């Protein structure tokens, strides 16, 4: 029939990983050097194009 | 001739240049009448051109293309037992669908294939017709009418080669049965040819167990009886000779457990042979070596059948593997839960050799979790080493929360309601929630109960339970039946075994009362409370703060934590007061849940429930009357109204209640009935022994997507509640209620629907043996 | 539940019931029971004014064909086992040749019973069932099995002359490819849409021709029940290929004289050059021996469950599994009479022997019908 | 503590004493890896020292342990068979 007139109140999402904090690398002294990256954990780190968050592509 | 241009007259699916590439007369190439006819077939070789007429304007080609693509819809009609997507799967098997081209040739072919689908499923007397309904711009609808005459159903097996057993008893030894009478009606009768194969293995097992090792099935031919229903068969077998287990000569990669292996060779030399036990003893090795770490214990029997004495010798070949197969385990379906709470539910540890049942024991904790819908195991032996098995556990979780309600005592005369909700480990976070209460202008009842079962890894089950009832019976004031009752219960859960489990805790309860009814056992309990009340007036006020020790015990060998099928969870509960309490009494209660599978594929399961309960004094001051036993309505018994089972109230001839309305409430007062008034209000008895006879039934009437969750069960209950102190010298005009013979009875059916936030149970029940004074509502909502 | 969700198929009834030669019976005697629902290739036999009648699961009479009075009785409802006086339960039709009663059971036993009392002249268990009544002749119990075995037994004792494996379909595509004898060679058709010729005297395959299509990747008719029993007039064989297809072909070689791969006919008599048929949809037609050329037809009756077409009193006589009996013109399809003689219906075949016409209802069996 | 029902804690990755007799110092890692396979632990930045080590908690009384460390060199060739009991 009808379900109008503010059917949802404070219902949405966000961009929390962007809102999350970044990280910081870890140190191993001389002689304690073990493998640290085992796959796609190595990524190209990039400021390939910004306009992030809500400024990202919408359509 | 060389083409100047090809005129692409209507494509409707394909591109212009993609049409040009199918043409062998494309722009820039020499064109003759042969390649024009090569263009007819190659544009037909697209599979999407209904008609192609390659012509030319001198040399400038022009192709009158008619086109078959998208079928816009396929309309099914007349199936009524089979899903139309299954018929669309046959249409998928032709590679034709919405979007595809139509082919008038494949109309009868898919009609044949659906009649061949009809042929396969269990019919043949079922015809179809595809109605092409042409739609705009190239499109067509495939309207499909399914003229299903009748199915094929079994009539009679013939078995030839049988020389020890009845064919007809073997029907009774087979799943396929042909017997539903008119005055001895039992079961149903169907056909599918895969069951024929299964009945053959049933027979293959049926001769294996005796020692028939020269037994073989020759063949089996179904009579294509000219009626399109007649399913008679012959079954060609060779009976073979009987053979006897004369010895076992097991060897192989015995891995030093050869004595433990020999424990699985515990046989008698010369008993008549069965291979299922040989199959069974093979599994026990894989349970032996499975708990000994061997994830692939390859075991290969070989029956060295000796026809010379009609016996069998038993070669069994063994490959073990290794122990430390188990590397680690993975978990899937933690998306709304806490992983360690899942990962605490195991007993096979990473960094160990495999325990095969330790998985399953852990999976039993997963099974007796009950916060799941599936718990599944994914035993991936990791490549790189056979000391590497990572067992993923994809589980399907379950719904959480459960609300209960009854709309009553207002909702238009003020803000008044029932309340109550659970959260069921608080979305699996580790914190069991059950809360209820009610806010009315009769009373204000509050309650809290919360349990972390796992404060420590030792199963430290802190259950904290609270309540604050302002139970006043508010009609004008605190004059009718008042108790501000409040207090707590700290309780701990105790592991005693993997199945034995103790409960104990400490309870506080403080109750403050005012101006109570001319109920006389209420006066009698006040008299056993050492108090001497005015029996003819509700003016009597009381404060009591009781102090009790609570205890209990749990068994758990019963299948699921939410949908169990077999076994028992024996649940001792009880309580007793302490020095320092104003009353010295006790209460103990025994309720059970015994599950016996009628069907052991569990289409039918006997469920056994009773409720034993008894509480009385430790000398002098007794157990209070509100701690008696009250039933009816739903509680474990339907047919009645709630708490309408037990001894009933009598009013003392009464004067002044501190509420004398205009004949609204009758309490033997001076507003009428100024005399002894035995009332029908079931005030409960100090002893309860009730039970029900409830049995699992299936439901073949709905989609079994949700029937697996739905419980369908008929129940048959009875009950008797009574107070041991009922001395009918004082109840000389009243029925005695120290009797364990107040035999009520009702029966009915249970209708549980599993809603996505808890179960929705409903019932109808009709009592047909009853000790009167009870209120009855034969329909029940059990939300 | 199951009574309300019933799915029904619909056939055309029997039209043009006639009585122009108003039918009656000579007697009924019947036997009592028989086929009923339990379909089989059993059918009665008649010779020497002795009705060779019986209950299928039960009694084994001998009825005197003047009144069907019992000459003698035995029963194969005896000889205790798992059933403890195990019932008769016959597969093939009745054969009485010489002083024996040759019959093949659904118990996969075959019998010779002395025709003067029914005393068992000899006994043999047949390996599996038979899709064929044994054509017991030439010292041989000529059998086409359910296993597709040409098991010839010496009809003096049942001594197995040979057992020769035959053409084989997937399942029992029901139809009698009876092993028929013609000019010294065993002539069998085949329920796999195939035909053959075999040496009668040793079971040596003279030739074998696949002809027509059958269920499994080209699924065929189950309202047409193909009489794959071959009838052989001179060495062009005229027989049916399973799915009902008509074929004329050399007996010496199996080479096709002509064939109708359009046939769905049920029961057939090559009546001169007017071959009389029962179609799947039960239109009658008279077809030639040079082709399937309609000399006359009858689509008048349609969609019943018929027996074999017989010629009696000069008229084409057929009964059905409804209980109706029909008297058609031997010429162009005209009802000479019609009789709904019972409702038990007739699965077995009319026996127009001894100058009589012997039929068998499903459980009301024998009505010796005259007009 | 004073508590009674404590379910037993177990851990494998532990070979028999015959498997200790199956090998010798100077065997390769592979010479162990053919017959005794891999352990479930070796040094992540240290040498190739292999760890087939037992652990088990018995009722009310400590934890049983059979440590066995297997020091291979940079060539993965055994240099020490080092076994340790509980404590």
């Amino acid at each position: 029939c009808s379900s109008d007139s503010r059917y949802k109140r404070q219902v949405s999402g966000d961009e929390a990983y962007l809102e999350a904090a970044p990280l910081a690398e870890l140190h191993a002294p001389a002689g304690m050097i073990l493998p640290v990256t085992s796959g796609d954990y190595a990524i190209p780190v990039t400021n390939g194009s910004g306009a992030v968050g809500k400024a990202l592509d919408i359509r | 001739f060389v083409v100047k241009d090809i005129h692409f007259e209507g494509l409707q699916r394909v591109a212009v240049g993609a049409a040009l590439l199918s043409m062998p007369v494309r722009t820039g190439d020499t064109v003759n009448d042969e390649d024009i006819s090569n263009t007819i077939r190659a544009l037909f070789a697209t599979g999407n051109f209904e008609d192609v007429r390659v012509l030319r304007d001198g040399d400038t080609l022009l192709v009158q293309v008619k086109e078959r693509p998208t079928i816009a819809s396929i309309t099914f009609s007349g199936n009524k037992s089979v899903k139309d997507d299954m018929l669309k799967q046959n249409l998928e098997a032709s590679g034709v669908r919405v979007g595809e081209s139509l082919d008038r040739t494949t109309i009868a072919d898919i009609e044949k294939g659906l009649e061949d689908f009809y042929y396969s499923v269990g019919k043949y007397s079922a015809s179809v017709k595809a109605v092409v309904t042409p739609l705009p711009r190239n499109r067509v609808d495939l309207k499909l009418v399914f003229q299903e005459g009748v199915s094929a159903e079994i009539q009679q097996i013939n078995i030839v080669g049988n020389h020890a057993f009845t064919t007809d008893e073997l029907i009774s030894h087979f799943q396929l049965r042909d017997e539903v009478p008119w005055w001895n009606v039992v079961g149903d009768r169907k056909y599918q040819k895969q069951k024929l194969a299964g009945d053959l293995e049933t027979l293959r097992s049926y001769y294996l167990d005796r020692g028939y090792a020269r037994f073989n099935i020759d063949s089996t031919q179904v009579s294509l009886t000219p009626d399109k229903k007649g399913i008679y068969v012959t079954v060609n077998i060779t009976e073979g000779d009987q053979y006897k287990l004369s010895g076992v000569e097991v060897s192989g990669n015995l891995a030093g457990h050869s004595a433990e292996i020999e424990q699985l060779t515990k046989i008698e030399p010369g008993e008549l042979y069965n291979g299922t036990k040989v199959t069974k003893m093979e599994d026990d090795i894989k349970k032996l070596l499975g708990r000994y770490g061997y994830a692939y214990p390859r075991v290969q029997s070989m029956p060295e059948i000796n026809d010379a004495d009609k016996t069998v010798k038993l070669r069994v070949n063994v490959d073990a593997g290794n122990r430390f197969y188990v590397r680690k385990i993975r978990f899937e379906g933690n998306d709304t839960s806490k992983d360690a709470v899942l990962r605490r539910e195991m007993r096979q540890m990473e960094g160990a050799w495999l325990g095969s049942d330790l998985v399953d024991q852990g999976k039993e904790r997963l099974n007796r979790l009950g916060f799941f819908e599936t718990v599944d195991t994914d035993t991936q032996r990791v490549p790189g080493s056979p000391d590497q098995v990572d067992v993923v556990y994809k589980v399907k979780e379950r719904n959480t929360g459960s609300f209960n309600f009854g709309i009553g005592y207002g909702t238009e005369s003020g803000v008044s309601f029932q309340a109550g909700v659970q959260q069921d480990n608080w979305l699996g976070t580790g914190y069991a929630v059950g809360i209820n209460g009610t806010k009315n202008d009769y009373q204000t009842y509050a309650e809290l109960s919360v349990t972390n079962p796992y404060f420590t890894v030792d199963g430290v089950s802190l259950g904290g339970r609270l309540f604050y009832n302002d139970f006043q019976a508010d009609d004008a004031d605190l004059s009718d039946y008042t108790n501000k009752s409040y207090g707590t219960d700290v309780t701990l859960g105790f592991p005693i075994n993997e199945y034995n489990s103790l409960r104990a805790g400490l309870g506080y309860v403080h109750n403050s009362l005012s101006n109570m009814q001319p109920q006389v056992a209420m006066w009698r309990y006040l008299y056993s409370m050492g108090e001497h009340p005015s029996t003819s007036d509700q003016d009597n006020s009381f404060k009591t703060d009781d102090f009790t020790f609570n205890y209990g015990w749990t068994y758990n060998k019963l299948d699921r934590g939410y949908f169990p099928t077999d076994g028992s969870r024996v649940n001792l509960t009880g309580k007793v007061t302490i020095p320092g309490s104003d009353n010295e009494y006790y209460k103990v209660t025994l309720d059970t849940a015994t599950y016996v599978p009628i069907d052991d594929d569990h289409k039918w399961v006997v469920l056994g429930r009773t409720r034993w309960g008894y509480g009385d004094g430790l000398g002098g001051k007794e157990m209070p009357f509100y701690e008696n036993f009250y039933a009816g309505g739903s509680s474990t018994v339907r047919g009645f109204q709630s708490n309408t089972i037990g001894p009933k109230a009598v009013y003392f001839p009464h004067q002044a209640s501190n509420y004398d309305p205009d004949y609204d409430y009758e309490c033997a007062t001076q507003d009428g009935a100024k005399d002894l008034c035995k009332s029908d209000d079931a005030v409960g008895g100090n002893a309860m022994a009730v039970a029900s006879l409830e049995f699992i039934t299936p439901t073949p009437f709905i989609s079994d997507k949700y029937a697996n969750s739905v419980r369908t069960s008929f129940f048959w209950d009875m009950g008797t509640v009574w107070d041991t102190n009922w001395d009918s010298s004082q109840y000389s005009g009243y029925p005695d209620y120290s009797d364990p013979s107040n035999i009520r009875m009702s029966a009915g059916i249970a209708l549980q629907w599993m809603s996505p936030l808890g179960p929705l149970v409903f019932s109808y029940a009709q009592p047909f043996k009853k000790y009167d004074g009870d209120k009855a509502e034969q329909f029940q909502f059990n939300i | 539940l199951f009574n309300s969700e019933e799915d029904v198929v619909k056939m055309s009834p029997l039209p043009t019931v006639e009585n122009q030669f108003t039918p009656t019976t000579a007697w009924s005697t019947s036997v009592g029971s028989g086929i009923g629902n339990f379909y089989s290739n059993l059918h009665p036999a008649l010779a020497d004014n002795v009705v060779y009648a019986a209950d299928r699961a039960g009694l084994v009479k001998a009825l005197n064909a003047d009144d069907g009075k019992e000459i003698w009785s035995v029963s194969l409802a005896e000889k205790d086992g798992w059933f403890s006086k195990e019932p008769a339960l016959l597969s093939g039709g009745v054969t009485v040749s010489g002083g024996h009663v040759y019959i093949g059971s659904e118990k996969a036993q075959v019998y010779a019973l002395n025709t003067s009392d029914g005393t068992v002249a000899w006994q043999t268990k047949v390996a599996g069932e038979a899709l064929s009544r044994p054509v017991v002749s030439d010292g041989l119990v000529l059998i086409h099995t359910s296993n597709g075995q040409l098991q010839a037994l010496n009809e003096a004792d049942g001594a197995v002359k040979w057992t020769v494996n035959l053409d084989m379909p997937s399942l029992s595509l029901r139809g009698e490819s009876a092993p028929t004898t013609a000019f010294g060679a065993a002539v069998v058709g085949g329920d796999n849409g195939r035909v053959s010729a075999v040496l009668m005297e040793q079971g040596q395959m003279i030739w074998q021709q696949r002809i027509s299509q059958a269920t499994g990747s080209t699924e065929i008719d189950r309202l047409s029940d193909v009489d794959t029993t071959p009838v052989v007039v001179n060495g062009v064989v005229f027989a049916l290929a399973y799915n009902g297809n008509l074929t004329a072909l050399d007996l010496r070689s199996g080479q096709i004289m002509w064939k109708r791969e359009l046939g769905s006919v049920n029961d057939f008599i090559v009546d001169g050059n007017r071959i009389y048929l029962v179609d799947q949809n039960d239109r009658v037609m008279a077809l030639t021996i040079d082709g399937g050329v309609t000399l006359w037809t009858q689509s008048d009756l349609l969609h019943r469950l018929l027996t074999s077409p017989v010629l009696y009193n000069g008229n084409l006589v057929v009964g059905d599994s409804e209980g109706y009996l029909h008297w058609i013109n031997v010429e162009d399809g005209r009802f000479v009479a019609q009789q709904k003689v019972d409702s038990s219906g007739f699965q077995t075949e009319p026996v127009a022997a001894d100058g009589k016409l012997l039929i068998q209802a499903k459980d009301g069996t024998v009505y010796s019908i005259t007009r | 503590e004073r508590v009674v029902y404590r379910p037993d804690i177990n851990q494998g990755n532990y070979l028999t004493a015959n498997d200790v007799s199956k090998i010798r110092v100077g065997m390769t890692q592979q010479q162990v890896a053919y017959a005794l396979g891999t352990p479930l632990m070796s040094d992540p930045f240290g040498t190739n020292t292999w760890f087939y080590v037992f652990r088990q908690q018995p009722g009310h009384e400590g934890v049983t342990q059979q440590t066995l460390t297997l020091t291979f060199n940079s060539s993965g060739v055994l240099t020490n068979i080092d076994n340790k009991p509980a404590l």
Binding site: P22, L26, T37, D40, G48, R59 | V457 | - | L40, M41
Partner: protein, 218 residues
């Protein structure tokens, strides 16, 4: 219920209901366009808006089928970078969307199944399109996810401590060691295998961590 309309108008009709937010009816327009004209020039642009409006109306399994459509339908396309984010953007919301975080509860102990998938897609995005408009954004998605995967496996390694399976502590943190340095939960997991070391009496091995502790306490 949408009639066969002008398809550009159908392309216009959903475009309102995108700006309107009526993806209950925008997708209702978007299906019947592609139910009739799926090979149209904007019908593949409809697919980008289909994944958009599926995401807008929270239709991830319906979206994920459409993502693999654009895999099959446009295995080469300039707009793959949108979908390559939108694949991981799905698997971001596919891994965690529930209400438990609304109560302040930290959902990095829940199953990182699609978080492993969103890790794949965004890494394929920064490799396949290292300069796209998402490549700054998808990075910080991957940045937190690396610790989200860590705090997942950190949550595993906690339980095995109170279990006491000190090897299974070490195999989890060595998995954490093999996968990421830069999570500080690794610094939180840093003493615990060293604690497992001395619990296994691997004190000399525990000394080696104590230098790394000395390397990673500062």
């Amino acid at each position: 219920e949408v009639p066969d309309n002008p398809p550009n108008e159908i392309y216009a009709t959903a475009q309102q209901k995108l700006q309107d937010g009526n993806w209950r009816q925008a997708i209702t327009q978007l299906e019947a366009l592609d139910n009739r004209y799926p090979f149209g020039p904007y019908s593949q642009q409809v697919q980008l808006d289909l994944i958009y409006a599926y995401y807008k109306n929270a239709d991830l399994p319906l979206a994920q089928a459409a993502i693999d459509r654009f895999i099959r339908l446009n295995p080469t396309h300039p707009n793959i970078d949108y979908v390559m984010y939108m694949r991981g953007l799905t698997n971001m919301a596919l891994d965690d969307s529930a209400l438990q975080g609304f109560f302040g509860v930290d959902r990095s102990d829940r199953d990182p199944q699609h978080a492993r998938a969103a890790f794949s897609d965004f890494s394929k995005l920064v490799r396949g399109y290292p300069n796209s408009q998402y490549t700054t954004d998808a990075t910080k998605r991957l940045v937190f996810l690396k610790d989200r995967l860590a705090k997942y496996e950190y949550s595993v390694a906690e339980y095995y401590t109170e279990r006491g399976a000190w090897v299974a502590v070490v195999n989890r943190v060595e998995g954490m060691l093999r996968d990421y340095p830069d999570t500080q939960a690794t610094r939180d997991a840093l003493p615990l295998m060293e604690n497992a070391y001395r619990q296994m009496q691997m004190n000399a091995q525990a000394e080696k961590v104590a230098k790394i502790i000395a390397a990673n306490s500062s």
